[PDB]
């Protein structure tokens, strides 16, 4: 509900990109392995199953 | 400087040469210079007309 009046200033550096991804284009890959079974969406390199 | 800016990902298509000259680069500074190094005489050639 109503809280105390709040003034918050946020600093964020949204400049961390190169070769930006296109809005279009979706690739689906199916693989045979013993682990990580199921769907694992991969948005970029940092989130890769280990 | 242009290569560094392109690596940063900024678009230089519309900027003037002056604008790219004074674009913010952070800590790094890029400069270049031209000099010519003198040398003492080592070879002498003379032609004499009698």
């Amino acid at each position: 509900a109503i809280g105390l009046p709040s003034i918050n200033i946020s600093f964020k550096e949204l400049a961390t990109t190169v070769k930006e991804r296109s809005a279009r284009g979706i690739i689906a890959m199916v693989l045979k392995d013993a682990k990580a079974l199921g769907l694992n969406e991969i948005h970029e390199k940092e989130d890769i199953p280990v | 400087q242009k290569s560094y800016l392109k690596s940063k990902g900024v678009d230089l298509s519309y900027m003037t040469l002056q604008e790219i000259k004074e674009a913010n680069t952070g800590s790094k500074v890029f400069l270049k210079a031209k000099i010519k190094v003198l040398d003492a005489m080592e070879d002498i050639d003379l032609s004499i007309e009698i």
Side-chain angles (χ1 to χ4, degrees):
Chain A
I2 300 193
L4 295 179
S6 71
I7 313 106
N8 42 344
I9 296 67
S10 286
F11 312 91
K12 79 207 167 206
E13 183 169 23
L14 169 152
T16 60
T17 201
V18 70
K19 210 203 193 170
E20 74 296 325
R21 81 183 69 243
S22 60
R24 264 62 169 279
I26 293 140
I27 311 181
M29 198 168 322
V30 80
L31 272 166
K32 325 198 275 213
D33 211 326
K35 303 299 176 50
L37 289 93
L39 184 129
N40 309 95
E41 71 88 20
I42 296 174
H43 206 294
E44 214 159 72
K45 183 45 187 278
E46 70 286 343
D47 37 3
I48 291 281
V50 282
Chain B
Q1 184 160 6
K2 162 164 48 69
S3 170
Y4 162 64
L5 260 48
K6 175 137 42 201
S7 83
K8 251 31 197 160
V10 293
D11 188 58
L12 309 175
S13 160
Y14 293 60
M15 261 171 286
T16 315
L17 307 180
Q18 264 279 113
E19 320 311 322
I20 311 196
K21 271 191 158 192
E22 54 210 355
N24 206 240
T25 50
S27 314
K28 311 167 190 171
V29 176
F30 304 98
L31 292 167
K32 85 170 188 178
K34 264 183 157 289
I35 62 171
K36 183 67 80 183
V37 187
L38 289 176
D39 199 352
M41 337 185 168
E42 68 280 11
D43 309 315
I44 303 179
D45 304 73
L46 193 68
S47 273
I48 321 168
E49 313 287 45
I50 320 89

